[PDB]
């Protein structure tokens, strides 16, 4: 057996080889797809189609007939045990009650946060972090490395980590003279007036692309806000995650949003599949999404950057398929 330490700082004994993993978190699921580990998975979170978006099943068609014995914050133990799982990955904020149910029937649990930062905060959906860039950078690296350890995909895990951070220098160099006054004021519109404030990867994606999350000085983490807040923030650009495409026409047809700068200027943009301005960091979000956003906001700085080719090279390696625009 092996002992690992998870991202809740839990010491966890697991089998030498893992072939029946149950993955109750979409971020870990996506990393495992990119490690070519899906043959070692036998169950996934029930809401995977919602969390990964309707086209995800093109990348991982095997997910279609995968048992679903739980979700982000609950588990069905009778369903779970039928799958004879050898490990369960859960999200870092999974309730204590849920982790206990799984540990009480002796299945190893590995919690994934994709963040280091303050230990007092590791189990919180919405953390307060003193150095969010380093927390998520180090957490991403650590989390991929742990996932890769569990599934014995060490080499691909190392390649994935290198690919995630490969364009961070380019963006640093090309946008290093962007003053705080000139930084592009950006809003992430999730369904039902959802948005991301502080302590979330969303804001960091925007920073690395020469932008700023308008919600982040007053909103903590993932929260429902009022239209009135969005009106006051008056963002220059509104972004929508690819997994929630209905939100774009919804904003564009809602008269109450019509006077926001981004509406007047026709800067409401559905973000590409890979360009996940999520609460959590994902390797393709760094490698490809951050470049997409930088190129969208500063195109005259990145004309030499062949993003189409970068996307293709990445997808062929980690998704074993081409990128298909929606």
From Swiss-Prot:
It comes from the Bacteria. SUPFAM superfamilies: Helical backbone' metal receptor. Molybdate binds at residues 26-27, 196, 243, 279-280. Keywords: Ion transport, Molybdenum, Periplasm, Signal, Transport. It is found in: Periplasm. PROSITE patterns: FE_B12_PBP. CDD domains: TroA_e (cd01142). GO terms for cellular component: periplasmic space. Its main location: periplasm. GO terms for biological process: cellular response to iron ion; monoatomic ion transport. The MolBCA complex shows a decrease in affinity in the presence of increasing concentrations of substrate and nucleotide. Residues 20-301 form the Fe/B12 periplasmic-binding domain. Belongs to the bacterial solute-binding protein 8 family. PANTHER family: MOLYBDATE-BINDING PROTEIN MOLA, VITAMIN B12-BINDING PROTEIN. Part of the ABC transporter complex MolBCA involved in molybdate import. Functions as a low-affinity molybdate transporter. Binds to both molybdate and tungstate, but not to sulfate or phosphate. Nucleotide binding is coupled to a conformational shift at the periplasmic gate. This shift is akin to unlocking a swinging door: allowing just enough space for molybdate to slip into the cell. The lower cytoplasmic gate, identified as gate I, remains open throughout the MolBC-A mechanism, and cytoplasmic gate II closes in the presence of nucleotide. The complex is composed of two ATP-binding proteins (MolC), two transmembrane proteins (MolB) and a solute-binding protein (MolA). This is Molybdate-binding protein MolA. It comes from Haemophilus influenzae (strain ATCC 51907 / DSM 11121 / KW20 / Rd). The gene is molA.
């Amino acid at each position: 057996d092996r002992i690992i330490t998870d991202q809740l700082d839990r010491k966890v004994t697991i089998p030498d080889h893992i072939n029946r993993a149950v993955v109750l978190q979409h971020q870990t699921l996506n990393i495992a797809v990119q490690l070519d580990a899906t043959k070692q998975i036998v169950g996934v979170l029930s809401n995977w189609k919602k969390q990964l978006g309707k086209n995800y099943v093109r990348l991982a068609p095997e997910l279609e007939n995968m048992a679903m014995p739980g979700d982000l914050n609950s588990v069905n133990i009778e369903s779970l045990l039928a799958l004879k799982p050898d490990v369960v990955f859960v999200t870092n904020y999974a309730p204590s009650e849920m982790i206990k149910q799984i540990s009480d029937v002796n299945i190893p649990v590995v919690a994934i946060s994709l963040r280091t930062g303050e230990v007092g905060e590791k189990g919180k959906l919405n953390p307060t972090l003193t150095d969010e860039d380093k927390a998520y950078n180090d957490g991403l690296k650590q989390g991929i490395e742990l996932i890769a350890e569990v599934f014995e995909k060490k080499q691909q895990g190392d390649e994935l980590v290198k690919a995630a951070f490969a364009n961070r220098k380019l963006l640093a160099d090309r946008l290093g003279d962007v003053s705080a006054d000139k930084r592009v004021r950006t809003y992430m519109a999730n369904p039902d007036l959802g948005t991301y404030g502080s302590g979330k990867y969303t804001g960091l994606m925007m920073e690395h692309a020469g932008a700023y999350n308008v919600a982040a000085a007053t909103i903590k983490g993932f929260k429902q806000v009022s239209l009135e807040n969005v009106l006051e923030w008056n963002p220059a650009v509104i972004l929508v995650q690819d997994r929630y495409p209905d939100v774009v026409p919804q904003i564009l047809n809602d008269q109450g949003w019509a006077n926001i700068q981004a509406l007047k200027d026709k800067k409401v943009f559905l973000m590409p599949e890979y360009a996940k301005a999520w609460g959590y960091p994902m390797p393709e979000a760094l490698a490809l999404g951050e470049v997409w956003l930088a190129k969208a906001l500063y195109p005259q700085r990145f004309q030499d950057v062949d993003l189409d080719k970068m996307v293709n090279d990445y997808y062929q390696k980690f998704y074993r398929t081409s990128y298909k625009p929606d």
